[PDB]
Design a protein around this nucleic acid. Structure first.
Ligand SMILES: [Zn+2]
Ligand SMILES: [Zn+2]
Lengths: 814, 115, 62
RNA sequence: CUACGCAGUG
RNA sequence: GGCACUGCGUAG
C-alpha cells in the first residue's frame, strides 16, 4: 500500500508516497498527511485522528471538518495529538543519545519512527569509536517542525513538573528574561540540532541565523505567559520627576532586546509619546470578554463603539440607467456592489479575526532555501538607507497615528523636525527599539460582502524610519518593468498586453492558473513576515552593519508585527499578521507570495516519485534540490541559480502582493514536476494555517481567453491596428455600483461627478468589445450619462464623451 | 518654529498631566521586586491600576465573571462601582437578570475599584 | 425591476434612519443594520419585501 | 516637474 | 478617517 517515505539514494531523492509494538502508521505518514493535504483523500489522516482518540468518525460527517477558519474546533482535535508528538521528540533524543553512546553515525528519517515514538531502524548506521557518534537530524527535525505548533506539542511545558494533569506553572509576574528556560527547552527536545541557537537574536550572526533562531523562539514562546512579552519598562528620573519608559522589548521570536541609549528634545518627546508605556501604565485595567485577544489597558473612561453609516444613493444615475433598459429581470448586469452598513460591535468583531493567526513553526531548511531562491527575484533592484532630504512622501495630510493624531497631521511633524532631527531619530532607531501604537479604523467603501474592512493606521515614528530604511528599494521595485513583481507596471497604454506577453514567454505547453490567500492579512505566520523584512533589508550590505540591521528588524517587529493596537480606546496586543497601513505592506506581501509559490514548487518536485520521471535533467534537479535543501548547511549559489532558471522557464509568475497569475508548462505539472492547485492548497494548509478552496482558484487552458481574473480584472483578446492585444475589463456590476452608490453626498451634485464618471468610463471602455450587448451597453450608458451631466451643467470638452479618448489609453504608443 | 514649539509644549503637557495620574505606591514595590529594575509593560495595569473596566457581551459571561457585587480578577478583589450599557446609560445591579437580559442594550461596561 | 429598486429604497431608508439619530440606540441600530444588510444581500423578492416592511415599520414606530 | 482633487487596484 | 501603485482632471 502507499506509504510516505523519505529517501535519499543515488537514483531517487525526495519525500513522497511509495508502494510498499509496531503501529499501522509511522510518523512520516502523519507528517505527509498534515503537509500534503487533500480533502478528497484524507483517509490516512482520518484513520490517524480516530485511532489515537483525537476524535471519532462522527466528527467527519459534518462539512468543513478540516477548515481552520470555518471549524476552529479542529485546532483542538489536532492539539489532542500534540502530547503524543512531544513524546516522540523526547524518545528521539534518547535514541540519539544511545547512538552517541554506541559510536554510531546515521541519518534519522521520519518513516523509521512509529506514531508511538519508538524507533525500529538500525540500518544506514556506520559503526565508529563509541562516544563519538554523530546523529544526523536535519531532515527529521526540519520536516517535523510544522507539526510541532500545529498540534501544540509543548503545552505540557506550561504545567508543573511537565504533567498535563497538574496545574499551571506560576511564573513570577515580574519575570521577562526567559533565556535560561529557552536553553533548557532547546537542550531537552533539540539536543542534537547542531546549529548554534541564540535565544536573544542580538547574538545572531547574519540573516539566516536570525531566521533559524527566530524559528526556534516562535515555538519556545508558546510555553511562557503572554503577559511577559511586550515592552520592558523602567522608572527613570527626568529632571527629578519619575517617568516610566521602555528600555527594551521582549519578542516572542527575537527574545529579549535591550536599548543602548538608556539614559537616567522633540525627538526624545516623540520616543516617549509613541511609547505605549505611559499610556498603558496610567490607564485603567481592562478585561474585554468580547474578544479572546489579550488586552492591556483602557485609555478612556468608556468603551467606544463606531458605526459605519450606509452609503449614499445616486438617484439620477439609477433613473438614467433604468431609462436605458438596465436592471431588468433576468439580465446579466446588476447591482451587486453596495455600501454595507455596520453596527457598534463591528470593529471589535473584525479585530477578533486575529484568532486565525496562530504561532507557526516553519520548515527551517526549506525556508532557508526558499528565501535564497526568493532573493533571486529581487536582484534586479538596488536599495539602501537614504538621508532625510531624499525621502519622497505622497500625502502629508494623513493621520499620524496615536497619540499623534491629537495634535495634527503628519505634515506638522515633518515641518517641525529639521533634516538633522530626522536623521538623528533614524540613527537612534538603529541602536534602540521604539514600540508604537497603531489604531484600527473601519473602512467605508464599495464592497460585495457584508463584512467590514479594518485598516491599521500606524504612528509617525514607524512611518518615518521605515521610509528612510526602505524607500530606495521600494522605488526601485516600483520602477522596474518586465520582472516577476509587477507593482508599478500600469495596465494602461498597452501595459496589460506587455505584462501578459511577459508571463507567456517561452513556455512549452502554457496553461494559466491563479489562486487567492484566504484571510491573508490575518492568518500570515510571523516567520514569513520576518523573512519578508529580511529579504527587503538584504539590500543594506554596505550602508548598515549587522547590529544596525538587526535593531531595524526589531523595530519593524515591534511596530508592525506585534505592536499595541488601540481599538475603541483600548490597548490590545496584536498576535501577529500584517499591518495593512504599514509602509511596506505590498512589497512584503509580494515577497510572501513568491515564497509560497516557490514552496509549492519545491513540494511538488520533491513529492514526485522520481523513479517514474522520464527526464534525466529533472531527476538530477530533484536529487540536487534535496541535497541543497536538507544536506547542505551553507548556501549553494550555483544550484540556486539553476533552480531559479528552471522555475523562470517552467513557472512564469505575475505577482501583485496578493494576486498572482502563473503561466506553467502543463505537461510538467501534470507529471508532477511543477506546482499545481493542490500543491498550493497543501502549502497554505501546513504553513499559512488556512484552507484554500477550489472555488476561488482557477485554471485556464487556452491562452487566447487569457487569465480568468487578475487584480479583479478579466481579460480578452481583441483586434486593433491589425494587432491582437489583451484588454482588461472589470465586472460591470462593480462599475454600475460605483456609479449608483457614492461615498459622500457632496459627490451627488457638482463638477466632481464628471471626473469621477470619466475615471469610470476609462475603466469600462474594454467592455465595448465584449460579445455580450449588455456589457458593451454599459460603456455607452456611461458616455451618455457624462454627456447628460455636461448638458445639465451648461471644443476641449467634447473629447470627454467621445470613444476616441478611452480608445487612446489602450494603444501602446504612450 | 512656532508650530514646533506648540507641539513640544503639548506633548510635554500631556506627559506631565498623565504622569500625575500615574501612581508610585505599587509601582515602586513592583520595580523593587525586579532585580534589574525592568518590568514588562503588561504587568503595570494588573498590579498598579485601581479602576477596572469589564466589557460583557452576554448574560452568560456576566454570571460567569462578575455576578456578585464584589468579584475577583488578577488575584485581586474588586468591588463594583457602576454598570453602563452600550447607550451610555446607568444600569442598576437588580436590573441585570436572565428575565431582563433581552431588554438590556448589550454589551455592558462594568466599572469597579480595587478593594 | 423589483429587486434593484427595493434594494435602493432600503439603502435610502437606512440612510434617513441614521439621520434620525437611530444609531444612538444600540439594539435598534443593530436590527436596522441586520435588516438592511440582509435586504441588500438577498436574492429572493419575497424576503426582500418582508424585510423591507419590517425596516419601514421600525422607521414608523417614531 | 511640483501642488490639490478624483477614480481604480492590493 | 491608513500604506503603496496607476490613471485622469484643473494650474506654473
Ligand atoms: Zn543566531
Ligand atoms: Zn542601510
Amino acid at each position: 500500500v502507499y506509504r510516505a517515505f523519505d529517501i535519499y539514494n543515488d537514483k531517487v531523492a525526495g519525500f513522497a508516497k511509495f508502494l510498499k509494538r509496531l503501529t499501522k502508521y509511522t510518523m512520516a505518514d502523519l507528517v505527509y498527511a498534515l503537509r500534503h493535504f487533500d480533502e478528497g483523500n484524507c483517509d490516512t489522516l482520518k484513520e490517524i485522528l480516530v485511532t489515537y482518540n483525537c476524535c471519532d468518525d462522527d466528527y467527519f460527517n459534518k462539512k468543513d471538518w478540516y477548515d481552520f477558519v470555518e471549524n476552529p474546533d479542529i485546532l483542538r482535535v489536532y492539539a489532542n495529538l500534540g502530547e503524543r508528538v512531544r513524546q516522540a521528540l523526547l524518545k528521539t533524543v534518547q535514541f540519539c543519545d544511545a547512538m552517541r553512546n554506541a559510536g554510531i553515525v546515521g541519518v534519522l528519517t521520519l518513516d523509521n519512527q512509529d506514531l508511538n515514538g519508538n524507533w525500529y531502524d538500525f540500518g544506514d548506521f556506520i559503526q565508529t569509536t563509541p562516544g563519538s557518534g554523530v546523529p544526523v537530524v536535519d531532515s527529521y527535525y526540519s520536516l517535523l517542525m510544522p507539526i510541532l505548533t500545529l498540534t501544540r506539542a509543548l503545552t505540557a511545558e506550561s504545567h508543573v513538573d511537565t504533567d498535563l494533569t497538574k496545574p499551571y506553572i506560576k511564573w513570577d509576574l515580574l519575570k521577562y528574561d526567559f533565556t535560561e528556560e529557552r536553553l533548557k527547552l532547546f537542550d531537552r527536545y533539540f539536543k542534537y540540532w547542531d546549529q548554534t541557537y541564540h535565544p536573544n537574536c542580538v547574538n545572531c550572526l547574519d540573516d539566516r541565523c536570525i531566521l533559524h533562531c527566530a524559528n526556534f523562539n516562535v515555538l519556545f514562546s508558546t510555553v511562557f505567559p503572554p503577559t511577559s512579552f511586550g515592552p520592558l519598562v523602567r522608572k527613570i528620573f527626568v529632571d527629578g520627576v519619575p517617568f516610566v519608559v521602555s528600555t527594551g522589548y521582549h519578542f516572542r521570536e527575537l527574545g529579549v532586546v535591550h536599548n543602548q541609549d538608556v539614559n537616567l528634545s522633540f525627538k526624545e518627546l516623540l520616543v516617549y509619546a509613541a511609547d505605549p508605556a505611559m499610556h498603558a501604565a496610567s490607564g485603567n485595567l481592562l478585561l474585554d470578554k468580547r474578544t479572546t485577544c489579550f488586552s492591556v489597558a483602557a485609555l478612556t473612561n468608556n468603551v467606544a463603539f463606531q458605526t459605519v453609516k450606509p452609503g449614499n444613493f445616486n438617484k439620477d444615475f439609477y433613473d438614467f440607467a433604468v431609462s436605458k433598459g438596465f436592471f431588468k429581470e433576468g439580465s446579466s448586469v446588476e447591482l451587486k456592489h453596495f455600501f454595507f452598513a455596520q453596527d457598534g460591535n463591528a470593529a471589535i468583531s473584525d479585530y477578533d479575526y486575529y484568532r486565525y493567526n496562530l504561532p507557526t513553526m516553519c520548515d527551517i531548511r526549506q525556508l532557508l532555501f526558499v528565501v535564497e531562491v526568493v532573493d533571486k527575484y529581487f536582484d534586479c533592484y538596488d536599495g539602501g538607507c537614504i538621508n532625510a532630504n531624499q525621502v519622497i512622501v505622497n500625502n502629508l495630510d494623513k493621520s499620524a497615528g496615536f497619540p499623534f493624531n491629537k495634535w495634527g497631521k503628519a505634515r506638522l511633524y515633518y515641518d517641525s523636525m529639521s533634516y538633522e532631527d530626522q536623521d538623528a531619530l533614524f540613527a537612534y532607531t538603529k541602536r534602540n527599539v521604539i514600540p508604537t501604537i497603531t489604531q484600527m479604523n473601519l473602512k467605508y467603501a464599495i464592497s460585495a460582502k457584508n463584512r467590514a474592512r479594518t485598516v491599521a493606521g500606524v504612528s509617525i515614528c514607524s512611518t518615518m524610519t521605515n521610509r528612510q530604511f526602505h524607500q530606495k528599494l521600494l522605488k526601485s521595485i516600483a520602477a522596474t518593468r518586465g520582472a516577476t513583481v509587477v507593482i508599478g507596471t500600469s495596465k494602461f497604454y498597452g501595459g496589460w498586453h506587455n505584462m501578459l506577453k511577459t508571463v507567456y514567454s517561452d513556455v512549452e505547453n502554457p496553461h494559466l492558473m491563479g489562486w487567492d490567500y484566504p484571510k491573508c492579512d490575518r492568518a500570515m505566520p510571523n516567520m514569513l513576515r520576518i523573512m519578508a523584512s529580511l529579504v527587503l533589508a538584504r539590500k543594506h550590505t554596505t550602508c548598515c552593519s549587522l547590529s544596525h540591521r538587526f535593531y531595524r528588524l526589531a523595530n519593524e517587529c515591534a511596530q508592525v508585527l506585534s505592536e499595541m493596537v488601540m481599538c475603541g480606546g483600548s490597548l490590545y496586543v496584536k498576535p501577529g499578521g500584517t499591518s495593512s497601513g504599514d509602509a511596506t505592506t505590498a512589497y512584503a506581501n509580494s515577497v510572501f507570495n513568491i515564497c509560497q509559490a516557490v514552496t509549492a514548487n519545491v513540494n511538488a518536485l520533491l513529492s514526485t516519485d522520481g523513479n517514474k520521471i522520464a527526464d534525466k535533467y529533472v531527476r538530477n534537479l530533484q536529487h540536487r534540490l534535496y541535497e541543497c535543501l536538507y544536506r547542505n548547511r551553507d548556501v549553494d549559489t550555483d544550484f540556486v541559480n539553476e533552480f531559479y532558471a528552471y522555475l523562470r522557464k517552467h513557472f512564469s509568475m505575475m505577482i501583485l502582493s496578493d494576486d498572482a497569475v502563473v503561466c506553467f508548462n502543463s505537461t510538467y505539472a501534470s507529471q508532477g514536476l511543477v506546482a499545481s492547485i493542490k500543491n498550493f492548497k497543501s502549502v497554505l494548509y501546513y504553513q499559512n494555517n488556512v484552507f484554500m478552496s477550489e472555488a476561488k482558484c482557477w485554471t485556464e487552458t487556452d491562452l487566447t481567453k487569457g487569465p480568468h481574473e487578475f487584480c479583479s480584472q478579466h481579460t480578452m483578446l481583441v483586434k486593433q491596428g491589425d494587432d491582437y492585444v489583451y484588454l482588461p475589463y472589470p465586472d460591470p456590476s462593480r462599475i454600475l455600483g460605483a456609479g449608483c452608490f457614492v461615498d459622500d453626498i457632496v459627490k451627488t451634485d457638482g463638477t466632481l461627478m464628471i471626473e469621477r464618471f470619466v475615471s469610470l468610463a476609462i475603466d469600462a471602455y474594454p467592455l465595448t468589445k465584449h460579445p455580450n450587448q449588455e456589457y458593451a451597453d454599459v460603456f455607452h450608458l456611461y458616455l451618455q450619462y457624462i454627456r447628460k451631466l455636461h448638458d445639465e451643467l451648461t471644443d476641449n470638452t467634447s473629447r470627454y464623451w467621445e470613444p476616441e479618448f478611452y480608445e487612446a489609453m489602450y494603444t501602446p504608443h504612450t | 518654529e512656532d508650530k514646533r514649539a506648540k507641539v513640544t509644549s503639548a506633548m510635554q503637557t500631556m506627559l506631565f498631566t498623565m504622569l500625575r495620574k500615574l501612581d508610585n505606591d505599587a509601582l515602586n514595590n513592583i520595580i523593587n521586586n525586579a532585580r534589574d529594575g525592568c518590568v514588562p509593560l503588561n504587568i503595570i495595569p494588573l498590579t498598579t491600576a485601581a479602576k477596572l473596566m469589564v466589557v460583557i457581551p452576554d448574560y452568560n459571561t456576566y454570571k460567569n465573571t462578575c455576578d456578585g457585587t464584589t468579584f475577583t480578577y488578577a488575584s485581586a478583589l474588586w468591588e463594583i462601582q457602576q454598570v453602563v450599557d452600550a447607550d451610555s446609560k446607568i444600569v442598576q445591579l437588580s436590573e441585570i437578570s436572565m428575565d431582563n437580559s433581552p431588554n438590556l442594550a448589550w454589551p455592558l461596561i462594568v466599572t469597579a475599584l480595587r478593594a | 425591476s423589483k429587486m434593484s429598486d427595493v434594494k435602493c429604497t432600503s439603502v435610502v431608508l437606512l440612510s434617513v434612519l441614521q439621520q434620525l439619530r437611530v444609531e444612538s440606540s444600540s439594539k435598534l441600530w443593530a436590527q436596522c443594520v441586520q435588516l438592511h444588510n440582509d435586504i441588500l444581500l438577498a436574492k429572493d423578492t419575497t424576503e426582500a419585501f418582508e424585510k423591507m416592511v419590517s425596516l419601514l415599520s421600525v422607521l414608523l414606530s417614531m
